[PDB]
């Protein structure tokens, strides 16, 4: 209406708003062991690429950045910026050592020698690929010979298969038993490594992560991190998995050592224990009320 008369009218309601955001969790436990595969003393050959599977653990991926300025970090599918959301179904990490300019052969779709006879990778794979230089750890000034690769074999490898089968190549048209000799060769040539080698011939350590999905168990594997806390301030709190809005204050309760929730007669939360540390806090709703406008006659 365009006019009002004498009286007090209940017009609106007022309340305070939260300022910060608080999240908490019972830290982490059972961490997936990425570190043990990223820092060892040996890395095996190329065609004998070690295989490992890990599951039923929480994941961090924070150890990835704690290394050298990675030569290549081309990861397909999932993006490093958003550290995934799903726990997939299983994950595998494959590690080996190759020679310099051969790192380009590790790709979804390509061809060559390493990615054709030694370690085949299908295009439908997404995973991630990591490679970094290690010239100062596995290169002695006498000729390294503990790394070998296959260079003479027919029937280009099918995706994700390993063939540790040393034989005598039958290049020719004669039977060959034992010593190769003429018109007959032996695969698995060595590498050689010296500290004065030029760039592109220095050793590189390569780790590829491949994970698969579409199954039921192990849905989400998140870090479930936590932040700081505030006192005497209208804020939104997310202790453990219970959310709320209000002001927290340390409470002189007698919580038994197996419970975290707290209630009252009217079935409302009024006491919560901290996830990480052991402390009980009472919760009070932020101030609110009604507003009345005492107005005399508008005439």
């Amino acid at each position: 209406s365009f006019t009002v008369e004498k009286g007090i009218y209940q017009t609106s309601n007022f309340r305070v708003q939260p300022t910060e955001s608080i999240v908490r969790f019972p830290n982490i436990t059972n961490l997936c062991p990425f570190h043990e595969v990223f820092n060892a003393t040996t890395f095996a050959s190329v065609y004998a690429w070690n295989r490992k599977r890990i599951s039923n653990c929480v994941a961090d991926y924070s150890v990835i950045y704690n290394f050298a300025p990675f030569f290549a970090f081309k990861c397909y599918g999932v993006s490093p910026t958003k550290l995934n959301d799903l726990c997939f179904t299983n994950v595998y990490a494959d590690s080996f050592v190759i020679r310099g300019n051969e790192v380009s052969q590790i790709a979804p779709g390509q061809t060559g020698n390493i990615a054709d006879y030694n370690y085949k990778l299908p295009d439908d794979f997404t995973g991630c690929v990591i490679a970094w230089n290690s010239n100062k750890l596995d290169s002695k000034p006498s000729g390294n010979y503990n790394y070998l690769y296959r260079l003479l074999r027919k029937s280009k490898l099918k995706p994700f298969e390993r063939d540790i089968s040393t034989e005598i190549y039958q290049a020719g048209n004669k039977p060959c038993n034992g010593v190769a000799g003429p018109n007959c060769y032996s695969p698995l040539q060595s590498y050689g490594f010296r500290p004065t080698y030029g760039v592109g011939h220095q050793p590189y350590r390569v780790v590829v992560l491949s994970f698969e999905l579409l199954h039921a168990p192990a849905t989400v594997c998140g870090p479930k991190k936590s932040t700081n806390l505030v006192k005497n301030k209208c804020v939104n709190f997310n202790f453990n998995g219970l959310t709320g809005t209000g002001v927290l204050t340390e409470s002189n309760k007698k919580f038994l050592p197996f419970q975290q929730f707290g209630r009252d007669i009217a079935d409302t939360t009024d006491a919560v224990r901290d996830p990480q540390t052991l402390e009980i806090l009472d919760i009070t709703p932020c101030s609110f009320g009604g507003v009345s406008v005492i107005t005399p006659g508008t005439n």
Partner: protein
């Protein structure tokens, strides 16, 4: 032996991990009725009320499970249970004849630290245990009074744990409705069954 006695007003566990003070709460789900038939010594029914006196009980055995395929060892050292034919009885022996994957290994300290009371329940996705110990007052019969039952272990994996084997008392549990009383500090001091006599039903109705 199939000796029988009176269960009395014992066998009440905490329905959930929630703190209350000076209030009464009505709770559903499985419980142990007052004044029931308890066997003073087996498809596991629904729950187990194992209440062995075992005054000294240095070590006896805690065999649980269901063809060399859930065994629990209650020695003074770590329990170490696993999900996996021997019948045992300086060492233990007589039990290392069936071997399998035997994974899900955890726990650090023995369940045993009198009268010891343990309630075991199994739901479709969890295996819950509850334990309590009380001093004896030098009497054969169960003591008169009420006491709580704290929860100890909730194993995530388990379907149909049936067979068990340790003077002890065995009782079974069924779904019921109870009314529990919380004291000032926040511990259960009294309980009322809502389907025993009309007076208790009236008490439950009136809260």
């Amino acid at each position: 032996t199939q000796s029988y006695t009176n269960s009395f007003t014992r066998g009440v566990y905490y329905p959930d991990k929630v703190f209350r003070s000076s209030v009464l709460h009505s709770t559903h789900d499985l419980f142990l009725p007052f004044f029931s038939n308890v066997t003073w010594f087996l498809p596991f029914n629904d729950g187990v009320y194992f209440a062995s006196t075992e005054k000294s009980n240095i070590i006896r055995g805690w065999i649980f499970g269901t063809d060399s395929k859930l065994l629990i060892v209650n020695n003074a050292t770590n329990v170490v249970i696993k999900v996996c034919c021997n019948d045992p009885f300086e060492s233990e022996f007589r039990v290392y004849s069936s071997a399998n994957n035997c994974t899900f290994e955890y726990v650090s300290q023995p369940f045993l630290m009198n009268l010891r009371e343990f309630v075991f329940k199994n739901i479709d996705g969890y295996f819950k245990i509850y334990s309590k110990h009380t001093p004896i007052n030098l009497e054969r019969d169960l003591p008169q009074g009420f006491s709580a039952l704290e929860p100890l272990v909730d194993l995530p994996i388990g379907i149909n744990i049936t067979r068990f084997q340790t003077a002890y008392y065995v009782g079974y549990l069924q779904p019921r409705t109870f009314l529990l009383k919380y004291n000032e500090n926040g511990t259960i001091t009294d309980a009322v069954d809502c389907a025993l006599d009309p007076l208790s039903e009236t008490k439950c109705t009136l809260k």
